[PDB]
């Protein structure tokens, strides 16, 4: 996360993250108690999901690692085609039902699209610099704006289908790399999930793309309504 800060600790108790090992993966995002959306191009045969984490090394005391039992990516997602990010999507199934307070929460899926000019919030622990990247011990958020369709268009031409949103900031403040599958909070509900982006992060120029979460809104609640 780019141009950002230090999240105040547990202040995304949504925020989820992908590991192998110690090994850091992605982002994700509690939606579920036993549900976690991210994106599709970080679908891995195992690994487990964190939560309730705030910084890597150092035991925090809401932290739950639970392993996930089936990954479900979006069907229409490619990952053959590179650079065709299209439908960056996927459901982890929690083993165990996690623990739930102030530390650890599912947040609410956006039931509206979002408008051009909406203030958002990026958060992940990739790297918080680039193109010469640091990779934060703690949780780093920013705030964004999100970017009217045709500006994202023109910024990636041929690359922006209606899955997609972008958000930028002028000041900098942008996703990068590790913070991918994490969330992208807007007006308290999840909009979006980090998916792509330009080289380098934060640039005035290109904003970051998110998988728009309004459009798969039928699915998530399909697979996640399900008796799993
Ligand atoms: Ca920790």
Not at 12 to 29: E, H, I, R, S, Y
């Amino acid at each position: 996360v780019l141009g950002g800060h230090e999240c105040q600790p547990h202040s995304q108790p949504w925020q989820a993250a992908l590991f192998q090992g110690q090994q850091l993966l992605c982002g994700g995002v509690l939606v579920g108690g036993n549900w976690v959306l991210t994106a599709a191009h970080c679908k891995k045969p195992k690994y487990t999901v964190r939560l309730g984490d705030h910084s890597l090394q150092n035991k925090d005391g809401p932290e739950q690692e639970i392993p996930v039992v089936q990954s479900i990516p979006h069907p229409c997602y490619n990952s053959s085609d590179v650079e065709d990010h299209n439908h960056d999507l996927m459901l982890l199934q929690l083993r165990d039902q996690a623990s739930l307070g102030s530390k650890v929460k599912p947040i609410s899926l956006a039931d509206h699209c979002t408008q051009p000019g909406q203030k958002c919030t990026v958060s992940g622990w990739g790297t918080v610099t680039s193109p010469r990247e640091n990779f934060p011990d703690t949780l780093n958020c920013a705030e964004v704006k999100i970017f009217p369709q045709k500006k994202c268009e023109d910024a990636y031409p041929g690359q922006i289908t209606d899955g997609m949103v972008c958000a930028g900031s002028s000041k900098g403040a942008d996703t990068c790399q590790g913070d991918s599958g994490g969330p992208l909070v807007c007006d308290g509900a999840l909009q979006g999930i980090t998916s792509w982006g330009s080289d380098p992060c934060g640039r005035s120029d290109k904003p970051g793309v998110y998988t728009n979460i309004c459009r798969y809104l039928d699915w998530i609640k399909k697979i996640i309504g399900s008796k799993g």
